[PDB]
Amino acid sequence: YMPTIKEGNSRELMGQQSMPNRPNYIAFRDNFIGLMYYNSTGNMGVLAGQ
Amino acid sequence: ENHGTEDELPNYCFPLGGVINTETLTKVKPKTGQENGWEKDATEFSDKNEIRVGNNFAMEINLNANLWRNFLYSNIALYLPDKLKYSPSNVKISDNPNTYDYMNKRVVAPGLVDCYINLGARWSLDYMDNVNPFNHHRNAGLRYRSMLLGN
Amino acid sequence: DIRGVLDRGPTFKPYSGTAYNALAPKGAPNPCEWDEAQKTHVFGQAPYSGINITKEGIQIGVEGQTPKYADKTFQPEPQIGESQWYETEINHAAGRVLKKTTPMKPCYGSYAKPTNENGGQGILVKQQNGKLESQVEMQFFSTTEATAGNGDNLTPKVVLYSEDVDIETPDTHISYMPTIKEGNSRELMGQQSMPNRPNYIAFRDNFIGLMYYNSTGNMGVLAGQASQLNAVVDLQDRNTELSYQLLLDSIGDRTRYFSMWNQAVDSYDPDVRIIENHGTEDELPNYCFPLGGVINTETLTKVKPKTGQENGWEKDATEFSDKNEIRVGNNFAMEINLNANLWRNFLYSNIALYLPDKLKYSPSNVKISDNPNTYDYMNKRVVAPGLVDCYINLGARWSLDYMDNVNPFNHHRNAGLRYRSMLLGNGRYVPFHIQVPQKFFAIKNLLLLPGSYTYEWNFRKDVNMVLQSSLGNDLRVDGASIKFDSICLYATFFPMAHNTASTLEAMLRNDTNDQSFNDYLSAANMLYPIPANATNVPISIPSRNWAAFRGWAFTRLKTKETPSLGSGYDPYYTYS
Amino acid sequence: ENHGTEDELPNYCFPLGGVINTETLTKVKPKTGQENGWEKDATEFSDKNEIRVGNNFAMEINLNANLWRNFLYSNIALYLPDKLKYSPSNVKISDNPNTYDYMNKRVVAPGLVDCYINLGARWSLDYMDNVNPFNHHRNAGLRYRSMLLGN
Amino acid sequence: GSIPYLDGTFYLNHTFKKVAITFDSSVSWPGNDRLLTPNEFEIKRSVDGEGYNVAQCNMTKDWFLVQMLANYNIGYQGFYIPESYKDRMYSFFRNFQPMSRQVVDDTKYKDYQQVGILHQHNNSGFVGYLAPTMREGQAYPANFPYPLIGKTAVDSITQKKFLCDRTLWRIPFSSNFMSMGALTDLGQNLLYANSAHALDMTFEVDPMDEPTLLYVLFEVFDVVRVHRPHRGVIETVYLRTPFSAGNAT
Ligand SMILES: [Ca+2]
Ligand SMILES: [Ca+2]
């Protein structure tokens, strides 16, 4: 809640109220999905006799 | 699954010191030889004493309803579709509708989901059926894989 | 397959607490005004702020240069006030108030239907010409000292819109009535309200009671089309439903829920029957502070050292205003105790109310019913919270003596019951549509063969049998009703190849491949009466054969809760 | 495992009667004829009517944070190693550190373990690693065996 | 966020309405008049006249039978809760939820008055206004929501729906919708393996205001054979039928 759009410090600004930010986790996926290329003819893997 | 709450009793909060609305009073002893009438006495009792009359002063609060309301607002109302929220006033906000900032600074009226919606009815809000329920902060697996890396 | 219309009666309430103004303190009244020895007194609130007040109302904006005033039908709304926490001065406040015709009820649990789209509530009335017109009066108030003078200016300060709503309370009741005398008066301002006891209602488990079993009066029939020879013969003591329950428990899991057959198992909370009482964890105090941080400030003036005086303290206000606010010492704050209150509320709400009736006592100045089965009587009795408080049997795993013989399945945490009640919706009028299985043991798994058969059965319409009710109100008195609309029968055929099916039929008509079926309970049932305060029950059985016996199994029931199976309708069975 | 608390909404108390800061007023009606004229009216309404201007008194409290803080102090902070606590003042205490009294009357500052330690981190305090976790009052088995004998 | 197409978290199954299948554009494949409805599988009805719903929800009987069969071979001898070990996390029966409620009937209640969000003042005097900010306003009897219980209740209508997430919808290519082995009896019949055919499917779904995708899995046979004739040499052969992909000399 911002009572006045002014700047600096003035009498009105004493009325403002605060509130916490939403929580937000970030981590790797399940089973590291997406960490290796599959089913993409551009970057197909290789396992073959030397 | 809204069963209401159990609030058959009032929950009060009393003054820190026990009573604050005291008033001053002075000792008195019955006059002898008259069958009535009285007189002052300062031989042993200080002539100033503090005493409260009537009950003590206390304020009320409904407890269970507040907890239920907090849970209901925090874990459902925020995740409503973006077409039900209005932008704030006198605050600079982003315009890209995917940034964290824009997703954070939109505001939503509590009246949309309060402690009386679909009372006594096992139901799920229509606005929330076609919104992904795995994007959440009670998603136990996600929270675990997030805490595993650290904080 | 069955469809029809169900009416659960006016004593259906599936939620604890209430749903209107639930956050309000349970004693605060509504803005009202009444009569005394004859003059009128007014009590109310005025939250709204304005600009200027004239005899037309209260200005709320400018349209061009012309002032714009309030719309007396839904203007200043009850939920709009100021926004800044720190108090300022307002000189033109407005508000709403109820006329003196409307009865006075506490704010807690007070409702009144809206009467126009904008959201205002006010009883419309007929005009001389056919038309509905609102009736809201305005009342102006000025400062006492201002009137205590001359009417040179005498401008009003506060404006109140007085109306008369159709107030009503749908789910609460008065727990304290200061005076029996009716009408509006000074006394009634003290009354207090509290919510009604929660009470679910639903169909039973596995639709017990919806079909007639073990009643040779209305026995079912399944027979060959032209033989007319019944194949179902039932005795008056082969209890069937309990056998089906036991079989369902034995062949599979039970805690899970299957909606199709309405298959949910009655069960009590594991912590209500027995009271594990550990006390509470309240080492720290849990204060509460003033909205503004501190409100007991005092005024002070800046002072600066002097020069050449060793104390010259002199005033100085060239830059700092002469009056500043400052608080000395700590700040005002009040105390509470959280966990104790939560535990106490749980104990009162889940155990104290369900005590035997003989401990409660009728209230004062409130009319009550007489049939001790009606919801009204069960709801308007009062029980002192001293019997079960936060200090009962401390440190002990124990259950109260009185609550031992009281049925623990008649409760409002019977998860099966609440599930079955929610499965029909939260309303009062329900169009329902269900499927009912078949439970007789001689045709439960029988494998029929080609032909034409006649199949006929009977269903109950009594309400005390087919609908449960977490309490026991005799539902016939409480206006419950159920009306059937249509029935249909469903069947499913395996698409077996023709010649293979012919071979199977031919093999299965040879009299050495007949079918054998055994009931699960497989026993004969007898009930005997026990009068009040008895201690010894002898029974006898005359001489007979005893080949291939198996054993005994006994239990004990209350007579108040056992219907008289064997006739069409038992009018002396009032419980549920 | 510290997710913090869900405290988006305030939880205000309220005065027992609903309002306590009223003030007196007198009914006034528009004097006819001259515009903007007003006059005192007391034919039907008493000269003393109580009305409150503005919002009503209320005090704020935080619920979920208080509950979590109470739990944290009760079930962990007390069981810290004895080397961190300090003796009380002006209270006689025992000298045999194995007694019940010595374990009871020592005090420990809540600041060591509050509602802001290792936020968002699934972790256990290094201090509590080498303290027996079965000597505790939430040990379900011990509680059951104690209640079985009696209270 | 979580990508349903990769880690299997689906939440939209409850928006299909009906499915129809045809071989060679003129022959319907429920076959030979099997289902209650003539030509297609109906997976949810809004308005019913002849009572085809089941489980106190809005799912036609059929579809219920088809799913129970194709997942547990249950349904030709009465319905019952399947065993725990045959009912995994991603199964069908674990993830079925029927729900119902009642609301005010505007056309029948003679005092209906639509009130927006801006003019509902329940719990009026002790809570903010269209924000979680500080409290405001005065106390007053509330005007929302209409009561549905008690002796002064309003007239009402009923709504029913179901929720079923985390699972795919299944249709097996058998003669009687049973699981009698990996290689079905209809995948071997000469008619479907010694000629050609053209396929036409038609889905009808409920509308949403966002571009979407329809996800179809054709269950097929995919097999690899591996041969190692010498030291440090490895040959492989792949087969995938019907949707073949490979060379041919
Ligand atoms: Ca002062
Ligand atoms: Ca001063």
Swiss-Prot record, chains B, D:
Induction info: Expressed in the late phase of the viral replicative cycle.
Domain of life: Viruses
Localisation: Virion; Host nucleus
Record function comment: Major capsid protein that self-associates to form 240 hexon trimers, each in the shape of a hexagon, building most of the pseudo T=25 capsid. Assembled into trimeric units with the help of the chaperone shutoff protein. Transported by pre-protein VI to the nucleus where it associates with other structural proteins to form an empty capsid. Might be involved, through its interaction with host dyneins, in the intracellular microtubule-dependent transport of incoming viral capsid to the nucleus.
Subunit architecture: Homotrimer. Interacts with the capsid vertex protein; this interaction binds the peripentonal hexons to the neighboring penton base. Interacts with the hexon-linking protein; this interaction tethers the hexons surrounding the penton to those situated in the central plate of the facet. Interacts with the hexon-interlacing protein; this interaction lashes the hexons together. Interacts with host dyneins DYNC1LI1 and DYNC1I2; this interaction might be involved in intracellular microtubule-dependent transport of incoming viral capsid.
Family the UniProt entry places it in: Belongs to the adenoviridae hexon protein family.
Note: All late proteins expressed from the major late promoter are produced by alternative splicing and alternative polyadenylation of the same gene giving rise to non-overlapping ORFs. A leader sequence is present in the N-terminus of all these mRNAs and is recognized by the viral shutoff protein to provide expression although conventional translation via ribosome scanning from the cap has been shut off in the host cell.
Protein name (record): Hexon protein
Organism of this sequence: Human adenovirus C serotype 5 (HAdV-5)
Recorded name of the encoding gene: L3
